[PDB]
Structure formats: structure tokens, C-alpha cells
Design a protein around this ligand. Structure first.
Ligand SMILES: Cc1cc(/C=C/C#N)cc(C)c1Nc1ccnc(Nc2ccc(C#N)cc2)n1
Ligand SMILES: CCOC(=O)c1cnn2ccccc12
Lengths: 412, 556
């Protein structure tokens, strides 16, 4: 009914992406889920004349007994046309990040109400593998807007608008933002009735047609940043001064006015690393001038919607992780630190996977897009484990860092 | 007649912008022509091909070849051109099962489905592209033109479409008979089960009746194939599996091609025979690529070869998978970046074995390699069994804990226990987190002239100890490492070292226990002898005491 024509971008074929190995429990889950989707008309079995593939796996969101199918559409998304057709795109709301509470809803099930263009369905092909390839993999494609595909929120947008219209007119101060399968709803209300307002929202979706009941509570107004701070000490060792001059040298790339000359003079001669050195007056003045410089914002920092966001992460030890989001080197758009647990105390890779998810969430809230990650992990280790910890319905792009950054110690 | 269910055709297209083949038919001898006409007349009467009119523009060449040293002929249609122009397909069978993931079976029966193999209909709209021409006797009449109504042998889409069609037919049978397994390859259909023999035979008769729904007839005379089966380089038996015989040739002289074949056999053998090593043999294959060249075997390659011969002296078999039991994976370090592993359920009976080799890299260490081996085995295990094995690893729990908590990267290995089975993986050194009180402090530097390759490396200390060494044929990076080496060599058991070298810090922060670099190896050997080492970095050219003084010394 009223199918929107969709195309790949010029000169591109559909995705052929290998299905990665799935555990028995994930395969069983996916067989059950897909058997039901097939009965409901959402997917159909396909024949050998469809060469395309996109990987699929299954996740369990936070505190739930049910598996959720997750298709990794990253390749299809790159290869799918940008949508200029009717809408020129929404300006990203700048007020969302200022709200006291933002709840995240998974609305993706609504997409299944819209048929997918018959000519484009083949590009949604996916396979449920069998253990040890003992039986033929089960091959399906979508008949309707799939969750995880960038085209789905685009094509459904005129429907979502009508759905939320009474809630928006009734609650003009509440910010609603849609990214992929997620709806982000912010408000300044007391948490008890914020929760009522979102539940009021759920009903509009629940009443219309047909994991929605879930919600993920954020408080972005309390989100912090990490300015460059220098130690305040009564006695400085040679080693302390060396680390200070190192950190200032690094900072001077970000802040031009930074000077190390007087501090660098302090160590004069070759002294024991642990020896205490009294600061000269010139050294104290310089340090003071440097502190004041570091209280000001970085010069010439601006977000460009046309450039990728890059996120770097450092493992600081004891469950602590620092990160920076930028576009251009030394102009950081956001920095942050997670000192936290949420299980994972004996698992580094789980911690990193949770950090990646938290950073991507912040990115979506602030800029409305996901960044490209530089991960401090060996590719094979990440690729083996990340799907075990993944609770998000989207997936960002990543690359791997194999050389230890010297700058880790300065974000500590 | 008994109505039969038609096989639904798969719609097929040429690649975008491509037309069908038009390829000249080469002349044939009068004999070949008579043979092809007969062959095609038979094929045509059973409906496999049909005569076509002059209007079809397409052509694919046809040949007449022979069976083995005798009188009979076979038709070969060369589809190379049509294949280039045909769309890609999804093949159900690719990524074959590993025997180690199979389940033991009391009975395995084989059925002959060769008549289905040649009977699957081809999409009506695509048939025209399959056109071929038997040349006329003497070229005095139009050649006889035919096209295919069924999947042709040699055509790009035949295997995928045959597999998909057979799958669709078998699916309801398999689904409603969870007590059997089925596998189909070419003209054979295999059915295994644990059923009482009476029940098993009944199942086979039911399958035969099922297949009859599509008109596929299975010869009543029973199959001459029974276990053990030779399949895909393996031997499958009802209760055990192995690789087909591996016999290592004797020769006084070895050739590139001979060595490649040897390594190939050894790699194949390594999935069952524990402890197979290819390092020194694959080493002889480096960067040559002239297949007739004779390479003298190193003493190391000879040792490896003899070690392999002993491993291969008598047959070894794997058992099959029991889903009711835990999978255990045990790994051993073999030296030279080589690792070996066994996967088992009950002690002393392996499901399979295998090996892992260290990645190409400038610097490395045993803990990283063991971690890599674990992730590889983990991924293989997910493929074969759908679950991660519990690991038995030659590294102490305390060693692992010290490693991962201090390593600059996130790292993880899944549930595992220490097995004390030398050689053990250990940390050969760990650097201090804070400067050492009472330890001498060495400020090191090195520099080289990029033109002449002359350089200097050295240190100065808080005790007034100093050294500068002149160096030739060196680089700034090498001099920076040489300076750290000198400080290690000349200091006591506890030492603080201050360097400006980001290059050296990056190497040392990677924690190598072994290097392609001679100098890094010497540094590692010295670190191993220390009780405590603190390594401090400072930026160059900043006026940092002991750093200039040594920087100035080493510059000129
Ligand atoms: C992959 C496969 C190849 C062949 C046959 C290929 C050929 N030629 C026969 C069968 C039935 C299967 N499929 C499965 C599936 C699950 N367990 C098993 N176990 C199993 C198979 C054969 C023997 C024996 N002998 C024992 C156990 N086979
Ligand atoms: C055509 C190839 O079919 C199979 O090998 C096969 C193995 N299990 N199985 C179950 C249903 C259908 C086909 C199969």
C-alpha cells in the first residue's frame, strides 16, 4: 500500500556480507523469531537467485527475558540512496541535550506496518546459519520496513508525525527526536511524572495499529566534560615536574599560549627522579599563567555536519575509561570519563563495548549521528566478543589502534 | 498416470547490460557429429533439450569427448562464456560441515538420486541463452540447433539451483522426522539415524515414497556405498572420523612444488594428528615462486620433518560430538610462534586438533599469541559446535591477571583454567608504575646524521656516571634504542631511565618478549635481569635537565 520507490546509490550492487558464526542459543532464538515474522508476513523465504546478504544476530536488552533480532545493515546503509525526495532532512534539535531527563524508546516495531518497495526487498536478504553448516541456512528477505535500515525512519516519518501529533500539541515543551529504531523523548519534569508522560506516549503508539514497554533513562543535563587540569602540589619531585612539562607540551598543541620555558629550567643538572625541587618564582608564575589559559575554551572549535565524528577511547585501568569526540585533531567537541562498573569488573572487552554504546548514545543526542571509533583493542579480540555485550539497536563504525598512544597519561 | 508435483523454476537473469553468448562452433570430425546427433536425439526425446528455429541469435560451443580408452562418446557443452554473463547465485552448500561437529550414528544409508540431478527444469525465459549447434555433415545444411530445458552440466547456476530445489523437496521430510539427519551431495542422498534397525529401514522407505511425489525414482537395488565413506578428504565411520591416508614421501632432493605439497598434507593432517608443525617447512617457500626450484632443507626443516613422521606413523581418529557434554580446548606452546591445540569431551579422545601460527610482526610476546590462539579456537568452535569450549591454558591465573589489568589495550579470554604443562607462558618483565627511590637515574639520548649514518648514543646519571658511544651505519631510531640498552647494561638491579624517544616508548609499552630487531632483543634480555625498571618519557628540546646535556653530547 503506497510503496515508496527506493534505490541504491549509482554504480553500487547490493550488500554481500558474510554471516559471522552464531552460537546455538542465538540460532535457536532467531529461528523462533523468524518463524513468527514469516507467519506475520514481515519476511519471506527467498531462492538462490538472490546473491545478497547482510549479517544477523540476536541480543538481549537490559533486563529482559526475550531475544531481539538485530540485523547489521551497516553495508546496506552505506549503499542506500540518501533521501532528498520529499523532506530535505530534519534540523537536529539542540534542546534535547539540555533536557533534565531523556528516555529512549525502541519504536522499531512500528516500521513493520509499512510495506517495503518490491524492487528493493532483495537487498535485505539475510541467512540464519545452522551449526556446523549441517542443514542449509535459512534464507529470508523483508517485505516491510526492516529495523536497523536507514531508509525505515525516512519512509515512516510521515506516519510517525501523524501518530505523535496529539502528544506534541498537548505537550509543546517535550522534545521528541527519532534516530533509527529509537525515539528520544526529553523533559524537565519530575522523574515520577516524566515516566507518566512517556507512558502516555507509549499509548499513542500502542493504540495505533498493532520492546516498546522498555525505556532507557538518560539525564544529559548532568553529563560532564574533562577540562585540562594540572596538579596542585606543595612539593614537586623531578619526576612530577617532568610529567607536568610533558602534559603542558601536549596541551600547547591545543592551547597556543602555553609556555614551559621557566618550568623546564627547574630541574637544572641531572637529578635523581625522586628528588624534591623547590619551584622558582618564575616557574610559579608560568604555572599560574598556564592554569588560567586552561580555564578558557579551545579556540576555533566548531561542528561541521558534513564531516565524520571521530571517537577515541583510552583504557585507564580499574574500570576507568576516557574518551574524546572530535572532527579535527586537537579540537575536541566533547571529552569525558567513565569511572563505573555495571558488571564487567573482570572483563575489559565488556567494559569497552558498554563504553562504545554510551558514547554513541551521547553522539546521537548531541549531533544526531554516530561517530567512527578508534578502539584500543586487537581486531580479532573485538570481533570475537562485541556481539555478546551489545544492547543497542544500531551499530557504529570502528577501526583498531595497535600502537599505544602516549597521550593516555594526559587524559588521566 | 500418477500426478507429480512440478519443481518450481528459479527465475534467472544475465548481469546488467550483458547479452547472451554468441560463440562460434568449431568444426568437428564426421564421427563426432554422428555421435552428438545420436546423443542429442536421446536427450531430446526425454525432454532435456529442444530443437530451436533460426531466430535465436545465441550460441555456445559443443564438443565430443571420450570415456576412458574405449568406444563411446559424451557431449560436452562449453559454458564458459554464458557463465561470465550469468548473474551470481547463493549456494546452499558452501562451507561444508566439519566431521568433528557431526554426531555419531548407528546407521547411515545412501540413496541414488542421480535422475533428479539431470531433471531440474530451467527458467523458461533463460533457455534461449543456452542455445548450441551441432555442425552439419560436410557443412552442406544448417547445423542442428538445440537449447536446454533443464539445468545444464557446467552452467554457473546449476549447482545452486539444484541444491535449492532438492532442499525444498527434502525440507518437509526432515522437519517431520527430527529423529534422522539427511545430507545430499550430487547424486547421493545420505540418511543417518540412531533408530532401531527396523525403524531405520522404514524411514528410508518413507523417504523414497516422499521423493516419488516429485517423480524422483530411487533404484530398489541397494546402494554399493556403505560406511566408511570417503568424503571431502576425510573418512567418515559410524562412530569415528579421520583424514584420508597421509603418507610423507622420501626424497633426497626437494622442490618448491614438493615442499608446497608436503605443507599442504601436513596442514590437512593437523586437524586430527596432534602436534604437527609447519614453520620451518613453510619457511623454505619464502618469496621464490619458481615451482621447479630445488631447495636444500635446513637442519631445522629436517628436524621438523622427522618430528612430523613420528606423529604420522600410525592412524589416529577423532570421535564425534556429544551435545550433552562440555567441550574442552587445551593449548600448548611449541616455540617459534607455533601453537597447537586439542579439543575433547572425554579425556584422551579428541574431537579434533589444530594449530595456530604467530602473525607477521616486528615485535610480539607469548601472552598476545596465546590470546590470539584462544580467539581463533573460539571462533572455530562456534562454527563447528555453536559454543565456546572451556580452555585449559599453560599460563598461571596470577600471570594473566597481572597482564590484562596493566596492558594498555582491552583484552579478554573466556572461561579457562591453568594446566601446568611446560613450557608455561609468563611475563618476562614488568615496568614500575612509579620512580624508584634510591635507584640511580639515567638520562639517555642518541642521535644520528641522516646523510652519513654516523651517530652517538649515551647517558648521564645523577651520580655523574656517563657514557657516549660512537656508532656507524645507524639511524636516529636505532641510536635511541642503543642509549636505553647502554643504561640497562651499566646500571644496577633497580634503575630509573629517562628518554625523549617516543619510538622507544611505543615499543616498550607494547611489552614484547621477542623482536625482529636485534637491539630490541638485547633490551629485552637486559630488562629480564633487572629487579625494577622505571621508564620515564620527557619531550625533546625542552630544556629538561640531563636530557640536553646528553642530547648535546650525542648530537656532535
Ligand atoms: C554431513 C554429512 C555427511 C554425510 C556423508 C558424506 C559422504 N560421503 C552423511 C551425513 C548424514 C551428514 N550429515 C550429518 C549430520 C549430523 N551428523 C552426522 N553424523 C554422521 C555422518 C556419517 C557417518 C558415517 N559413516 C557417521 C555420523 N552426519
Ligand atoms: C540439498 C542439500 O540438502 C541437504 O544437504 C540437507 C541436510 N539437511 N537438510 C534438511 C532439509 C533439507 C535439506 C537438507
Amino acid at each position: 500500500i503506497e510503496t515508496v520507490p527506493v534505490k541504491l546509490k549509482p554504480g553500487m550492487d547490493g550488500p554481500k556480507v558474510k554471516q559471522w558464526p552464531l552460537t546455538e542459543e542465538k540460532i535457536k532464538a532467531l529461528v523462533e523469531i523468524c518463524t513468527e515474522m514469516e507467519k506475520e508476513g514481515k519476511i519471506s523465504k527467498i531462492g538462490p537467485e538472490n546473491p545478497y546478504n547482510t549479517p544477523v544476530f540476536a541480543i538481549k536488552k537490559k533486563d529482559s527475558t526475550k531475544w531481539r533480532k538485530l540485523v547489521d545493515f551497516r553495508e546496506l546503509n552505506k549503499r542506500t540512496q540518501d533521501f532528498w525526495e520529499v523532506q530535505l532532512g530534519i534540523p537536529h534539535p539542540a534542546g534535547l541535550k539540555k533536557k533534565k531527563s531523556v528516555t529512549v524508546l525502541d519504536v522499531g516495531d512500528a516500521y513493520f506496518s509499512v510495506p517495503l518497495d518490491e524492487d528493493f526487498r532483495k537487498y535485505t536478504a539475510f541467512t540464519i546459519p545452522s551449526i556446523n553448516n549441517e542443514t542449509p541456512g535459512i534464507r529470508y528477505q523483508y517485505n516491510v520496513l526492516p529495523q536497523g535500515w536507514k531508509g525505515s525512519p525516512a519512509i515512516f516519518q510521515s506516519s510517525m508525525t501523524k501518530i505523535l501529533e496529539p502528544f506534541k500539541k498537548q505537550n509543546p515543551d517535550i522534545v521528541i527526536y527519532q534516530y533509527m529504531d529509537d525515539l528520544y523523548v526529553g523533559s524537565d519534569l519530575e522523574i515520577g511524572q516524566h515516566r507518566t508522560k512517556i507512558e502516555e506516549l507509549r499509548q499513542h503508539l500502542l493504540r495505533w495499529g498493532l520492546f516498546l514497554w522498555m525505556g532507557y533513562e538518560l539525564h544529559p543535563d548532568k553529563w560532564t566534560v574533562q577540562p585540562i587540569v594540572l596538579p596542585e602540589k606543595d612539593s614537586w619531585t623531578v619526576n612530577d615536574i617532568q610529567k607536568l612539562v610533558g602534559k603542558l607540551n601536549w596541551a600547547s598543541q591545543i592551547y597556543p599560549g602555553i609556555k614551559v620555558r621557566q618550568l623546564s629550567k627547574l630541574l637544572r643538572g641531572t637529578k635523581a627522579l625522586t628528588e624534591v625541587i623547590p619551584l622558582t618564582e618564575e616557574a610559579e608564575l608560568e604555572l599560574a599563567e598556564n592554569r588560567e589559559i586552561l580555564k578558557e575554551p579551545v579556540h576555533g572549535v566548531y561542528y561541521d555536519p558534513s564531516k565524520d565524528l571521530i571517537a577515541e577511547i583510552q583504557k585507564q585501568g580499574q574500570g576507568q575509561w576516557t574518551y574524546q569526540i572530535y572532527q579535527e585533531p586537537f579540537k575536541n567537541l566533547k571529552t569525558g570519563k567513565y569511572a563505573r562498573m555495571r558488571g564487567a569488573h573482570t572483563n575489559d572487552v565488556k567494559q569497552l563495548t558498554e563504553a562504545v554504546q554510551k558514547i554513541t548514545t551521547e553522539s546521537i543526542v548531541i549531533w544526531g549521528k554516530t561517530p567512527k571509533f578508534k578502539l584500543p583493542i586487537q581486531k580479532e579480540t573485538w570481533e570475537t566478543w562485541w556481539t555478546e555485550y551489545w544492547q543497542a539497536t544500531w551499530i557504529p563504525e570502528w577501526e583498531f589502534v595497535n600502537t599505544p598512544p602516549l597521550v593516555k597519561l594526559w587524559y588521566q | 498416470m500418477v500426478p507429480i508435483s512440478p519443481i518450481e523454476t528459479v527465475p534467472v537473469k544475465l548481469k546488467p547490460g550483458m547479452d547472451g553468448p554468441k560463440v562460434k562452433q568449431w568444426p568437428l570430425t564426421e564421427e563426432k557429429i554422428k555421435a552428438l546427433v545420436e546423443i542429442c536425439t536421446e536427450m531430446e526425446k526425454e525432454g532435456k533439450i529442444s530443437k530451436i528455429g533460426p531466430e535465436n541469435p545465441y550460441n555456445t560451443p559443443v564438443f565430443a569427448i571420450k570415456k576412458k580408452d574405449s568406444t563411446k562418446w559424451r557431449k560436452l557443452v562449453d559454458f564458459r562464456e554464458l557463465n561470465k554473463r550469468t548473474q551470481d547465485f547463493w549456494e546452499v552448500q558452501l562451507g561444508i560441515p566439519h566431521p568433528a561437529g557431526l554426531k555419531k550414528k548407528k546407521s547411515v544409508t545412501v540413496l541414488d538420486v542421480g535422475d533428479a540431478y539431470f531433471s531440474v527444469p530451467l527458467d523458461e525465459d533463460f533457455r534461449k541463452y543456452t542455445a548450441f549447434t551441432i555442425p552439419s555433415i560436410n557443412n552442406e545444411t544448417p547445423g542442428i540447433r538445440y537449447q536446454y530445458n533443464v539445468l545444464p552440466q557446467g552452467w554457473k547456476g546449476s549447482p545452486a539451483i539444484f541444491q535449492s530445489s532438492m532442499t525444498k523437496i527434502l525440507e518437509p521430510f526432515a522437519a517431520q522426522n527430527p529423529d534422522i539427519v539427511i545430507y545430499q551431495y550430487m547424486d547421493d542422498l545420505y540418511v543417518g539415524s540412531d533408530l532401531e534397525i527396523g525403524q531405520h529401514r522404514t524411514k528410508i522407505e518413507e523417504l523414497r515414497q516422499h521423493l516419488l511425489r516429485w517423480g524422483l525414482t530411487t533404484p530398489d537395488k541397494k546402494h554399493q556405498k556403505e560406511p566408511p565413506f570417503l568424503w571431502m578428504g576425510y573418512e567418515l565411520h559410524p562412530d569415528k572420523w579421520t583424514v584420508q591416508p597421509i603418507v610423507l614421501p622420501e626424497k633426497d632432493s626437494w622442490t618448491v612444488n614438493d615442499i608446497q605439497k608436503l605443507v599442504g598434507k601436513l596442514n590437512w593432517a593437523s586437524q586430527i594428528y596432534p602436534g604437527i608443525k609447519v614453520r620451518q617447512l613453510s619457511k623454505l617457500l619464502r618469496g621464490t615462486k619458481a615451482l621447479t626450484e630445488v631447495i636444500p632443507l635446513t637442519e631445522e626443516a629436517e628436524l621438523e620433518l622427522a618430528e612430523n613422521r613420528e606423529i604420522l606413523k600410525e592412524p589416529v581418529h577423532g570421535v564425534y560430538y556429544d551435545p550433552s557434554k562440555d567441550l574442552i580446548a587445551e593449548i600448548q606452546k611449541q616455540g617459534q610462534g607455533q601453537w597447537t591445540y586439542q579439543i575433547y569431551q572425554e579425556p584422551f579422545k579428541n574431537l579434533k586438533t589444530g594449530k595456530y601460527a604467530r602473525m607477521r610482526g616486528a615485535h610480539t610476546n607469548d601472552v598476545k599469541q596465546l590470546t590470539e590462539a584462544v580467539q581463533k579456537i573460539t571462533t572455530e568452535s562456534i562454527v563447528i559446535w555453536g559454543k565456546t569450549p572451556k580452555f585449559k591454558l599453560p599460563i598461571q591465573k596470577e600471570t594473566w591477571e597481572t597482564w590484562w589489568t596493566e596492558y594498555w589495550q582491552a583484552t579478554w579470554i573466556p572461561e579457562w583454567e591453568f594446566v601446568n604443562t611446560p613450557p608455561l607462558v609468563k611475563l618476562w618483565y614488568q615496568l614500575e608504575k612509579e620512580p624508584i627511590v634510591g635507584a640511580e637515574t639515567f638520562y639517555v639520548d642518541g642521535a644520528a646524521n641522516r646523510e652519513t649514518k654516523l651517530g652517538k648514543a649515551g647517558y648521564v646519571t645523577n651520580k655523574g656516571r656517563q657514557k657516549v658511544v660512537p656508532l656507524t651505519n645507524t639511524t636516529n631510531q636505532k641510536t635511541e634504542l642503543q642509549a636505553i640498552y647502554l643504561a640497562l647494561q651499566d646500571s644496577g638491579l633497580e634503575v630509573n631511565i629517562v628518554t625523549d624517544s617516543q619510538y622507544a616508548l611505543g615499543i616498550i609499552q607494547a611489552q614484547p618478549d621477542k623482536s625482529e630487531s636485534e637491539l630490541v632483543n638485547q633490551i629485552i634480555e637486559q630488562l629480564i635481569k633487572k629487579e625494577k625498571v622505571y621508564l620515564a618519557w620527557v619531550p625533546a628540546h625542552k630544556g629538561i635537565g640531563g636530557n640536553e646535556q646528553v642530547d648535546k653530547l650525542v648530537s656532535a
